[model samples]
Target: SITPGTYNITNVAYTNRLIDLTGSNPAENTLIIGHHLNKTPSGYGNQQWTLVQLPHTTIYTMQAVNPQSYVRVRDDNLVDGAALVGSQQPTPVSIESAGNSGQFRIKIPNLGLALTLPSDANSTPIVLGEVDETSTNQLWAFESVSA
Candidate 1:
């Protein structure tokens, strides 16, 4: 079972910067793809998240630290670049086996969308996409970060 605790999310394909917000606000913060090392440079707290299994379930909600919002599909839209949002009421995600190592899909059932890495590869904002094995960008891992 994936443990429930504070973590930093990273796209499994790249050592890209973790997730972050545009600023400290509740609306349209434009959840931006952050930096890493010299490539963009980033932090733990800025990306810190709380993920807990919904009681007796594999479903869990990812809550961001800085913005204090749960991760949700942007406006519940079903298009690419839909802009992942930090909402007061975030959508729950199910961790399904990705079969390519430790990767898994952060699936939002309501929208039938999966969290996807930026299509442009660098500093491109993460978005939602149809769940497909060919779209490796949709695969992610919720990793532990130092407190």
Candidate 2:
């Protein structure tokens, strides 16, 4: 189980990159993507997310540290290929152990879909996909970062 805190989320299959907002745009509805880890001060904050657990549930709401925008399914569409976007409202997501050390599957509980990165290329948008335990693309590791 993940402890609620700030994190730099990276796809297990693309460990060199971090989950980021496309173009580093903080506007609501900006798509979520995987970009090379930007260690520079100006861009790194866009890759940092603060996971806030609901009052009495294991579910969490991931918010970008820089802009304070929430990660939500685009248009609330809970189907395969539905892209994730930054929004003003929280979207509850469940984090399940992915059978790997410090790795987890971030899922939209209601749709039973996991966050999936389609490629290792930088700036590739993340989308929802059917859960596949055998696929590393759906597994993520959250590296804690200080607030």
Candidate 3:
């Protein structure tokens, strides 16, 4: 089970990269993309997220530390390739284990879609894709860190 905390969400397939906010700005509608991890203080906040679980539920709202925005699927679209963005409203999501140690799948149960990074390149947008258990793009690791 996942514990409520701050984390750096990294794609298992792209080991050194993380889910990052575009331009390190928290502005509403900023695209979420995969970027190489920047461990320096100036760049870390954009990649850091706070996972707050909904009371009595398995769902959570992933908030970007820098922009103070929640990660949400643009227009609540469930179709594959729909872009993920930072918004003021919380998007309910379930962070489930992907049957691998330290790996998890970020999902929207009602939509039956998962957060996915289509390519291993930095700046590649993170999108919503069908739940694919075998897809490394849908698998992520939550590396805990202090807020």
For each candidate in turn, the TM-score is: 0.78, 0.92, 0.92
Per-model CA lDDT versus the true structure: 0.67, 0.86, 0.85
**Which is the winner by lDDT between candidate 1 and candidate 2?**
2
The digit string of per-residue lDDT tens for model 2 on 73-139 reads 9988889989999999967899888766889999998666999999998899999999887889999
Q: What TM-score does candidate 1 get on C-alpha atoms?
A: 0.78
Global lDDT of model 2: 0.86
lDDT, residue 60, candidate 1: 90
> Please, what are the lDDT tens digits per residue for candidate 1 over residues 1-147?
467887766676665656654453456535645445222223544577788787777799887776677777677676755777677877778867677665778777555678777553556677777777777677766666665
* CA RMSD of all predictions: 3.2, 1.8, 1.7
Clashes of each: 1, 0, 1
Instruction: Please list the residue runs of candidate 1 whose C-alpha ends up more than 4 Å from where it truly belongs after superposition.
Output: 24-29, 32-34, 37-42, 78-81, 110-112, 120-122
Better of 1 and 3 by lDDT: 3
